[model samples]
Target: PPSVSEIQLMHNRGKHLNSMERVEWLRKKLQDVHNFPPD
Candidate 1:
C-alpha cells in the first residue's frame, strides 16, 4: 500500500483541482484506511 506522503504527492499532481480536491482525497483516504465503503 502507498504511504500518506505518496497519496499526497498524487493529489498534488492531479490537474484542475480545487478545495473539493482535498475534501474528496481525504474522504477516499479514510475510506481506504478503514476498508469502509459508502453506506
Candidate 2:
C-alpha cells in the first residue's frame, strides 16, 4: 500500500474524481482501512 495518507488524499474534496471506477476503488480501500485499522 502507498500509505494511508495517499489514500486519504485521493478522497480529498479538492481532488477531482476522475472516474466512477476509481472512486469506488478508493471507497473500498478506505473501508478496508476503517474495517481493519491494522495499518
Best by lDDT: 1
Q: Compared to the true structure, candidate 1 yields what TM-score?
A: 0.30
Q: What lDDT score goes with residue 26 in model 1?
A: 74
Off by over 4 Å in 2: 1-18, 31-39
Output the lDDT of residue 4, model 1: 47
TM-score of 2: 0.27
lDDT of 2 by residue, 1-39 (tens): 244455556555433454754666685665654556655
lDDT of 1 by residue, 1-39 (tens): 255454457655544445666677676665654454444
**Hey, what RMSD does candidate 2 come out at?**
7.6
**TM-score winner among the candidates?**
1
TM-score of each: 0.30, 0.27
Single out the weakest 10-residue window by summed lDDT for candidate 2. 9-18
